[model samples]
Target chain A: MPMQMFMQVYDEIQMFLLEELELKFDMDPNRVRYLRKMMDTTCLGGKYNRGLTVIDVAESLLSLDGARRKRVLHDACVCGWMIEFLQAHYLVEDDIMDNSVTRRGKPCWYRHPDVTVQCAINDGLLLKSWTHMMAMHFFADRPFLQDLLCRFNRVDYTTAVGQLYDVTSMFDSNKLDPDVSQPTTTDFAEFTLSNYKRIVKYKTAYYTYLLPLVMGLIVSEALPTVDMGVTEELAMLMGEYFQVQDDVMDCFTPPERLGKVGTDIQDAKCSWLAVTFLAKASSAQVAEFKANYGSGDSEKVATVRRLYEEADLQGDYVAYEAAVAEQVKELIEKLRLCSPGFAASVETLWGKTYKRQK
Target chain B: MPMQMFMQVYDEIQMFLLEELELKFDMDPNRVRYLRKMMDTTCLGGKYNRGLTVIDVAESLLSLDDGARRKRVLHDACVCGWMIEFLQAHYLVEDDIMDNSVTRRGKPCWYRHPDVTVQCAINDGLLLKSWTHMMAMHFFADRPFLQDLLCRFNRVDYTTAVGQLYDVTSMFDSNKLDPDVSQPTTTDFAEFTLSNYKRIVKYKTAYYTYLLPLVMGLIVSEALPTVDMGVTEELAMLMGEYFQVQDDVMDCFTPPERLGKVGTDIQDAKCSWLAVTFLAKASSAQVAEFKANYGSGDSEKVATVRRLYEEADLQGDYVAYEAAVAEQVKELIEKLRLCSPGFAASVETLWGKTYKRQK
Candidate 1:
């Protein structure tokens, strides 16, 4: 039922963006049509976990019955779609920056025949503008509007800073091509566990986990009463765990199953597997890992894959995942003593991501 | 005095953006250093007319006698001024990448810096954009018109994006780095009419450049209710169109040493005022000549187009057009003075600074 509300809001905002341009600006129909196509191509087809979490968490927090509940649900859906828009904004631009070709089982927005990198860049900006537009349109009269907008701003700034770390850690101008030079020795120096954690915390976790929960709280008016520091810490932990799982799947899952190709190794990403393996590998194993790890060659890539198997990294991953899950569950239980609804909401998020295959 | 206040605000916001990242995020020192450099290179060294206009107009609207009240108004005006600067920085960084330009404001474009790749510059542009909102929240959170300010910035931000789309799709060149993507089919020559050029200028250049700063000044000064915006908007659109036409003229006629950066409108296949107006007046043979010579980087080709412009007396036409626009602007200000003398005076101040400007 919440999903239905979320989907309805998406359609409504989509029409609002187009209609506003058409009526207010007298934008050319063909241009408006082009923008509509760009929005759908870039914004839809995501897993929508970040977006739906707003709805799910808001439902858990709010107990307003009947018409009031329905209205809040609609509001929650708008906020949910704002998250979706923010994600789309980052994905569209990041795909261009990362030189990615496929996203969500299709060509990246920039790779579409009709869309150039130039168009994609502006389209990303347009998607971001929609988030602000949504805030103004739906939350104009709401007292928490400023708080909500500030959260969006803060999250965006945080994520961009994380992206800076992520990009610079790899630090190769030549990484545009997959068949480029081997990763720099200095680049490998940045692939430490601490750096990886920082990168994941800022780049993936805040927007993916913490933002949705906070937005839900803000919308439900539960924010003022909740312990924000505790909520932030727990969300960050879950976000870190979720990103670690992503790093694992990037290596273990095939493109067909993962819904997109993984190039973390070739892209010289600061992944958990790389950092963990580097920490535990023998001296001889270190030399071998360095030789094969960031190579674009299929054979070298396979060699790196084999080394992961040889080192029983999968076993290590299983152990680490179980430890983190236990830790998060304990934290949720502690929260349940005070705020059962918030605890249960966070638990639902954990359940959705735990032991997932795709 | 206004310029000094404006410069001081630039320093304040620059420190704020850097300080916030350093203290709150545990950001790497080197990364913070890089961001500081990006902010300076992209945000500073512009003419700063759009930014300074905010202060110039706000001072006209508010008649603060108390020292504390005056200081508060000045500080708010400066913050609003820097917000416009940040918005410009965001647009300029992205536009530099899209246009594939080599230089901006007498120095290398930020993306063209040795350490900054297109990817890094793209993220840098996003960071610059994020600063505008951060500024609003940090500075305007308690203001009565906070929502008004956010809405104005968002609307202008969206409008500018749309205008950028119009500008990009109208270009005749296919100089994109990616080889697989075909040339955009939207760059139809038939659409390069004077009316279309005016629309592009109004959306892409006018609203943010003129209307936004004026309205921002009015809102921050608590003088929004006193002004008649219908007249103000009309005057802003005319002035914006005039300003852009002057830019188009300067791009062709002005020297690089004086202009600070070489104009690429012709080589970029931009639908500039000169190009549109020249096309309207060209003979059949001249039109064919233009088609052959325009939108090329070759010196000889550009020279030929310049020669055609001289032969067509475009510079003389611009002089006459400038007079006509000046007269119309004066008439509008007179109409504005009836309801809001102070705003009208501010508009006159802006016009005096803009008319017949060389840089």
Candidate 2:
């Protein structure tokens, strides 16, 4: 039933934007139709966990009943959808940057027969613009409008900085001719645990984990009373743990279950598995990984996979996941003394991502 | 003197952002270095006409008598000016990628650098946009008009994106063969009407170029209530259209040495003013020839279109058009002069910069 209500809110926001494009911008039917399709394909089909977290957090923070509760829930949903819009914007560009083929079990928007690279670039910008447009339109009268927009801008900057670090760490600046050179060992040298944590904190943790909770707090007018520095630290830990799980799933999970094929090895992504393996690998094993990790050949990729199996990374992940869960639980308990509602919200988010398969 | 003061603000904002990147983001020294170079290469070396217009408008609105208050107003105006430049840099970086342009500002585009890939350039553009917000927050967080400033930025940026969409899609020619996935295909003439051309310029070129800087100046000076918003928008749009038409003409008529970069509007089948005007006046046979030869890669085809532009006396048409728009500008300014001399003075300052110019 909650999922049903969430879907209804999505429909409402989508229609709001589509009508804005038509009436405000005087966009033609063809272009408006194209954008409508783009929104559905790229924004939907993802697990609504992040968006739903906003509503859950708000509900716990408020005690309103009847129509007032419904109104507040609708407002929370609007904020929740803005976070989704932000994620969709980042995903569209991330796919283009990674040269990925599939996302959310569908062909990437850029690779569509009709949507080429240029259109996808502009469409990505359109998605970002719509995030602000929605904020201005829906919350125009709210006192926290400026705070909400500024937060979005802050996260946008932080995420892009993280992406820059991720890309540079994975590829040699001098050898970035995609047609010519594969990633080199120097690129691997940048893949330490410290760098990995920083990258994950900036790229994944800030937007995915921290933003939704903060937005929820702002909407509920509880941000002034809450210690956000504590919330941010908790969010970062959970985000790092969540991304480590994602990196593991990319390697071990089946493509059918994962909703998309994994290319971390071939793409030379600075994934958690790679960082963990490099830390434990011998010189000979290091040499093998250095040679085969970023290679496009199927045999080389399989060799890297075999190397992971030999190291029993699955067992390592089991240990790592349990440790992170314990660490995160302690933080949640620490938070509980200060704010029970925020603690519960963290728990809700933790439960959703604790053992996600896709 | 204004140009000297303008250059100082550029350095200040550049250092502010670079320091933020180093301290706040903990960006590596190498990346900080790369971004500093990027800021200079793209943000600087522009005409700074749009940026300077903000300062000019603010100066006219305020009478500071060279006191500390005057200094503060000047500082705010310069920050707003650089904000416009930062916005321009963001647009150029992305547009260069979209157009598959090889050179900009007489040098290889930011994307064409050996060290920077298309992906990096895209992120760099996003970084530039982030800097705009950071600068706004840093400089104007305590100002009374911060909300108005940020909203104006959002609206103008969104409008520009819509304009760019119109510009790209209007020239979309699905029939053309594009073997290279990296480059944009040549545009067709199907949607190249004068109405479409006006819409493109009004959205793409006008809002950010003229309207935003003026509104920003007014907001900073606390003079926004004095002028009519609708009239301000109309005047800014007219001046922006005139400015873009001059640019279109110079692209065809001016030499590369003078213009600083070679023009590709014809080869790219851009909905330029000359092309639209010629289409409106040309014979049916000329129209056929024009359509056949336009947007071709061949130098000969490009020269053919240039020849058509000359034979049609587009320069003469442009002269007459300039005179007509000048009269309209004068009438609008006189109307404003009756109600608010300061606002009218600012509009005249902006109009003076835009009217009958050769780059």
Candidate 3:
């Protein structure tokens, strides 16, 4: 039923848009065709877990079983899909700019032989308009939804700003201490955390975790969920930990599983794990790592990986992930005082989410 | 007064769009600030002859001293400026992709810049929307002007298609064609004429030339003077001819008086009139004559120039240009019989725009 609501959202948006533009000239009908297909298969594959959680909470309060329950479930799913849509739009653009060439086990838009690079950029803008317009038209609108609109607008701009910082500073020669060619030894941990926090919070948390749950709580009116700022802070901290695990897997997982190499270090990645290892490395170890992994050459890329693996960085990442999981569980337990229902849902969702092997 | 209206049209669109977007966030405010500036400066500097002709027509029909004509003038200039904005948005994006750079003109907003490229592209669409909104808001709310609305929409999309075609073709083989590429002689004349017709109709005729005057004529009255499409067709032919001559002299008129180039054929980076002159070096004597007079290097970038001058192609161009002008004038005069007072008003206004050069 939650999946059906998301499908209805996909239908409603494309219908109204063509009717609105209603141009005298025939617009190219296929502009969003491939993107719609991508969203259907890849985006819909997520455990309808976050969505069903909202339905579960609403049912417990109302004891309802008719159309109102169905309407509430539809609204929950639509909002849930929106959070995914927002992330999908940014990742599509980032994938193109980053040149990873494939996504969700499919070829990236810009990397497609038939598509021009220009459309890859234009399609990103088109996706944003479609996503926002879907929220305004599909999901039921109300006073509480104004907060959703404000959040939507915040994510739109904040995500861009966060991406700007990442794309601009990720590889800057100025950011690195020239003699060492890494972030300054003393400040490496501090710099990496700042970058990681901004990226995970703005790019991932606002849209992915806090955004959907806040909508579920705010729209329910069953609890004192008014102070969503605190709710978001809690979710953001937990979501940050989830993202750190994903980052670690990207660097160490096999291609058949992760779909790409564990070349995060060779790619000159700025990560929490990479930074932790860098600060812990002996000065000579740091020098040797830079010499092997610095340039973009494939041979050099391979050498950099060997050095990090030899340093047992992957073992450290597993240790860090366990610590973050524990910290998040403690925070989730703390949330039970305010709204046990909201707290339980968040705990279960994050527990299952943070434990996924892939 | 004519040049002043062009700037006013742009400023009005800028003011109205800020209100439409209701920009609240600091980031939105920053984006708004940048887009409004781009809309004003980059969209404004086009040939005002197209815009001013609408006002000139309005002046003749609605008494000279009466003050009801400003809205009529604003609508035309708004459409003209909006069409130019549409053109610029496409070219700007295309240029950024071609250059493979992180920045544009001076700021970095194309895809993959410090800003999300898609977000900036959305701003580009908003600019296109605001342009059309000016005309609809100013003129047609009560009674409706759907026909003109429909026409302008089709024209914008079509012209963009044509412009994209030209831009893509020009760049398709640019990497291999070297700097001095020439159009194949097997199908030269037809290709050049079609290009000329497309560029002028899109940029001048359909967009800014006679469309505005015809539109302004219909908006203000019940029995609109421009009731017939024939009037618009004839008026466009004359205005279009006059526009071409103005372009010719603007390019040829010495450097101090030059509007950037001595001949646009070289700068347009295509085979225009000047090249056809050199290409017609039919006889050996004509070929030698063309070569003798033709200059070297990026000499006006009309790379085909030397061959033309050696062949006495300049003399040939003068003959063809004058004869073609006469033919167009003859056709226009014959068709002018169906014109109404509104049509005459538009024609006289366009004539006054000749050689009135100020970039």
**Docking band of candidate 3:** incorrect
Better of 1 and 3 by TM-score: 1
> What are the chain B TM-scores of all models?
0.94, 0.93, 0.62
Deviating ranges (above 4 Å) for candidate 2: A64-67, A171-187, B64-68, B173-188
Tens digit of per-residue lDDT, candidate 1, span A162-261 = 8887777776323422212233554366668888889989998889889999998888888866667777878888888888888888888987888777
Worst 10 residues of 1 chain A by lDDT: A173-182
Evaluate residue A217 in candidate 3 and report its C-alpha lDDT on the 0 to 100 scale.
64
Best by TM-score: 1
Cα displacement (angstroms), candidate 3, residue A132, comes to: 2.7
Better of 1 and 2 by TM-score: 1
RMSD of each: 3.6, 3.4, 10.8
Question: What is candidate 1's lDDT per residue for B1-359, written digit by digit as tens?
Answer: 88887888888888887888888988766677677778888889988888888888888888627577668877888898888888989999998888777777887777877667688789889988889888888888888888888788889988899888878777633233232356643233566679889888988888998899899888888888888888999999999989989888988889878877778888887889988888889898888888887888999899999999999999888889988998999999999999898889888888877998877
All candidates' TM-scores? 0.94, 0.93, 0.56
Between candidates 1 and 2, name the one with more favorable DockQ.
1
Cα-based lDDT for every prediction = 0.82, 0.83, 0.50
- Candidate 2 C-alpha lDDT tens digits along A25-59: 77777777778888988889999778899898888
Supply DockQ values for each candidate: 0.41, 0.34, 0.05
Clashing pairs in 3: B278-B308, B286-B311, B289-B310, B289-B311, B290-B309, B290-B310, B290-B311, B291-B310, B294-B306
